[PDB]
Amino acid sequence: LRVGNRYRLGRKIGSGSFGDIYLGTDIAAGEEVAIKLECVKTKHPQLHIESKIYKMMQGGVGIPTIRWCGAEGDYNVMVMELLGPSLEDLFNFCSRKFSLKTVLLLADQMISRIEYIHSKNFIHRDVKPDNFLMGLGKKGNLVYIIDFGLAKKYRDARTHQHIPYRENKNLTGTARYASINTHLGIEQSRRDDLESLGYVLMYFNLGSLPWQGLKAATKRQKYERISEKKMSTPIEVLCKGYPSEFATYLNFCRSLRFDDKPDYSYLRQLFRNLFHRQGFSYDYVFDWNMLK
Ligand SMILES: Nc1ncnc2c1ncn2[C@@H]1O[C@H](COP(=O)(O)O)[C@@H](O)[C@H]1O
């Protein structure tokens, strides 16, 4: 298929919940791209919404470039920079073990990506390893964030008036990485993206979280069981056997007020000081770079 005149559709490379991703070629440029397609007649149109958020994000480091948006035949179309494997994919490729160095290289960039989104007046609300992708080629050392399907404005662009506190929210995103405040049904804010990152980092450290693979028939009972395990696992128990910085990070996130601006710089400096105490260099040599 020809798309937006200059793009050629190739084979599927990924299946989302709200769109499939296809390999493509920018025939004019001689460059591979990713093409996201959404059936025009989909019950729940989201691609046009996601594209608007990407436009507001554009020019960020580790934000995929949007090359073209249109409709074509029975599809809404978004053409974007082609990225590499997700951190979940690379975790599986690494036998579900990341070195401390890799976890800290990732933590540094992931805190910066979340800060960048927050600087653009959005919270992501689906912080999980599947939504962070390494670049390809020259961008291969760069962590990207994707899937702004669930993203939401947390403050007025103009006034910076924060969204109001709200309760009795149904659980938006993946329960495994959801904040305790999300489990309580509280409106998500900047703190919740960062608390989710904290669970992602301990997930990379452990290979799994203690509230993973809990048995339930129905879904709300599964979320209640995840909530109960999360709220009965002290941060010092979750983080036992790992550097204290992972616990300090999570304690900091749990202490944030609904409308607080997180101290992103403090959280990066926490991991940077540990990184330096270990004698690591920021040379972007990740575990997966050493697979032969
Ligand atoms: N720009 C991209 N480059 C490569 N793979 C992508 C890209 N965007 C999404 N994917 C993949 O497509 C799936 C999810 O698409 P999405 O609905 O955009 O989150 C996952 O398998 C992602 O790894």
- DSSP assignment of 77-122, as one string? EEEEE----BHHHHHHHTTT---HHHHHHHHHHHHHHHHHHHHTTE
Query: Which two tokens mark 150?
Result: 């669930």
Residue 45 within any structural domain of the chain: yes
Cα dist from 208 to 8, 38, 107, 203, whole Å: 39, 33, 17, 5
Clarify whether residues 77 and 190 are in a common domain: no
Q: What are phi and psi of 10, to 5 degrees?
A: -110, -150
Q: What is the whole-number distance in angstroms between the Cα of residue 21 and the centre of ligand 1?
A: 6
CA of 136 to the centre of ligand 1 (A): 13
Find, among 160, 220, 233, 167, the residue nearest to 190 by Cα: 160
For the chain, give the number of residues. 292
Q: Is residue 232 part of a domain?
A: yes
Residues 181 and 222 in one domain: yes
The number of the ligand 1 atom at minimal distance from the alpha carbon of 15 is 13
At 148, list the tokens.
């702004």
**Are the C-beta atoms of 201 and 107 separated by less than 8 Å?**
yes
**Nearest one of 92, 163, 94, 91 to 123, comparing CA atoms:** 163
Distance set, CA 50 to CA 36, 106, 110, 122, 227 (Å): 11, 25, 20, 12, 29
Lookup result for tokens 């992708």: 133
- 211 lies in a domain? yes
Please tell me whether residues 67 and 109 are part of one structural domain: no
Q: Are 182 and 192 in contact (CB under 8 A)?
A: yes
Same domain, 70 and 143: no
**Does residue 275 lie in a domain region?**
yes
Q: Within a domain: residue 4?
A: no
Active site residue 126: yes
Are 19 and 130 found together in one domain?
no
> Is residue 63 located within the same domain as residue 112?
no
Q: Are residues 77 and 89 in the same domain?
A: no
Smallest Cα–Cα separation from 288: which of 62, 145, 91, 82?
91
Resolution at which this structure was determined, Å: 2.0
Q: Are residues 198 and 245 in the same domain?
A: yes
Asked if residue 2 belongs to a domain, the reply is no
The two tokens of residue 119 are 């600087």
Instruction: Catalytic residue, from 26, 74, 108, 126: name it.
Output: 126
Method by which this entry was solved: X-ray
Pair 183, 220 in one domain = yes
- Domain hosting 276: range is 84-290
Same domain, 49 and 135: no
**For the chain, how many structural domains are there in total?**
2
